[PDB]
Amino acid sequence: MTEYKLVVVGAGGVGKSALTIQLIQNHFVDDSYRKQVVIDGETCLLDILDTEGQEEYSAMRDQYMRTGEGFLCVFAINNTKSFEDIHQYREQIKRVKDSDDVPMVLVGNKCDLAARTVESRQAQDLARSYGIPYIETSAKTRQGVEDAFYTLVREIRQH
Ligand SMILES: Nc1nc2c(ncn2[C@@H]2O[C@H](COP(=O)(O)OP(=O)(O)NP(=O)(O)O)[C@@H](O)[C@H]2O)c(=O)[nH]1
Numbered sequence: 001m002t003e004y005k006l007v008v009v010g011a012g013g014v015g016k017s018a019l020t021i022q023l024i025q026n027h028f029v030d031d032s033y034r035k036q037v038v039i040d041g042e043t044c045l046l047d048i049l050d051t052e053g054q055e056e057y058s059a060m061r062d063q064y065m066r067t068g069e070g071f072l073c074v075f076a077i078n079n080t081k082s083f084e085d086i087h088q089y090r091e092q093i094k095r096v097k098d099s100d101d102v103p104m105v106l107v108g109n110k111c112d113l114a115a116r117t118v119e120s121r122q123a124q125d126l127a128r129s130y131g132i133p134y135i136e137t138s139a140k141t142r143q144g145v146e147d148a149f150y151t152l153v154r155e156i157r158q159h
């Protein structure tokens, strides 16, 4: 069966681990993660690398990242700086993979929260300028969680 190596990147505290744990174990929180799912009738194995938001420079984090086939770029909708940093993570991904066209999905997490600081429209405009999908998610309520990982799989299938 096909294996997709997905990797979740973004600034610290945006919910990368929470999104991974909700998808894999189905509980909001507050190792290595693998799961066998069915996406558009196709049974497949998702292997998720959950990453740290800062790490100076490590050729081993670079090498581990380079193994990924698709990337969730996560910011948090009540963290304006996390949204401003998205560009840096896309640059790192491009660099690590030597490609300007890596399967990618922009993810605005914590959409259960009120008093957001980043409007949907800013992220949509950014994603549509990158030509990648934009999904809003909540690891608490689970809205969007499977949407973002499965959409990223679809970005890989259709690459
Ligand atoms: N309300 C709410 N809180 C969330 C959501 N996702 C994560 N959080 C909270 O935000 C905090 C950070 O989550 P975490 O998953 O650790 O983020 P991270 O990006 O993995 N952090 P790190 O980069 O340091 O590993 C936790 O308290 C977590 O419960 C969400 O969708 N909604």
Ligand SMILES: [Mg+2]
Residues within 6 Å of the ligand: 015, 016, 017, 018, 050, 051, 052
């Ligand atoms: Mg984490």
